[PDB]
Design a protein around this ligand. Structure first.
Ligand SMILES: N[C@@H](CCC(=O)N[C@@H](CS)C(=O)NCC(=O)O)C(=O)O
Length: 207
């Protein structure tokens, strides 16, 4: 068994945290996979045929192409249940606004707009959960789907805000920092992350 994954070429689309979420899921389930790069920044109709919104990642499972990383990891969970990555529904929303807050802050040219505070507000909510719930991960001792969704977002956050704004996560958010190190140090992450240079380049137009 070998899962086909369509991701963006680093030169044309950058690094995608939603693609790395899928790849992490395959790694953690030890599912073999082959990565096919999509060279196009445009949307040729054969690509919109496999992916209605013209987005990566897309995955080929059971001879059919399926887009959307939320759908993809859920379908991989149903097809390959061991090891289980099911996140208990009550933790599904943990960290959910962080990535969006980071993009606004990264984009912002007005240091007075409140974007930085909005991001710290979301990081603090993650910190509250991690300090008051057994770790290392959001749901406990075992890694689950919510952790593989957050990890590439935390990675892009730290890399991109460190380069474009020499901004780092506040030192007082020690649980968040231990959480990211625990995720970044995993074999699945080291084998699916992009060079910092790719991350930085992917975001240059937005800054
Ligand atoms: N909700 C989708 C989001 C996927 C997504 O937005 N991918 C971006 C790259 S990070 C993309 O393909 N953008 C294509 C474009 O419109 O340029 C998912 O989880 O897979």
């Amino acid at each position: 068994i070998c899962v086909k994954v369509a991701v963006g070429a680093p030169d044309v689309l950058g690094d995608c945290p939603f693609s790395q979420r899928v790849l992490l899921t395959l790694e953690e389930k030890k599912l073999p996979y082959k990565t096919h790069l999509i060279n196009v920044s445009d949307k040729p109709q054969w690509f919109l045929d496999i992916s209605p919104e013209g987005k990566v990642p897309v995955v080929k499972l059971d001879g059919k192409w399926v887009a959307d990383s939320d759908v993809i990891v859920g379908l991989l969970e149903e097809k390959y249940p061991e090891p289980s990555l099911k996140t208990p529904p009550e933790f599904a929303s943990v960290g959910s606004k962080i990535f969006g807050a980071f993009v606004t802050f990264l984009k912002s040219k007005d240091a007075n707009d409140g974007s930085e505070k909005a991001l710290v507000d979301e990081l603090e909510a993650l910190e509250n959960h991690l300090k008051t719930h057994s770790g290392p991960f959001v749901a406990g001792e075992k890694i689950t789907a919510v952790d593989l969704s957050l990890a590439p977002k935390l990675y892009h956050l730290e890399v991109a805000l460190g380069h474009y704004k020499n901004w780092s996560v506040p030192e007082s958010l020690t649980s968040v920092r231990n959480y990211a190190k625990a995720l970044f140090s995993r074999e699945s992450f080291e084998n699916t992350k992009a060079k910092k240079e790719i991350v930085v380049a992917g975001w240059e137009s937005k800054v």
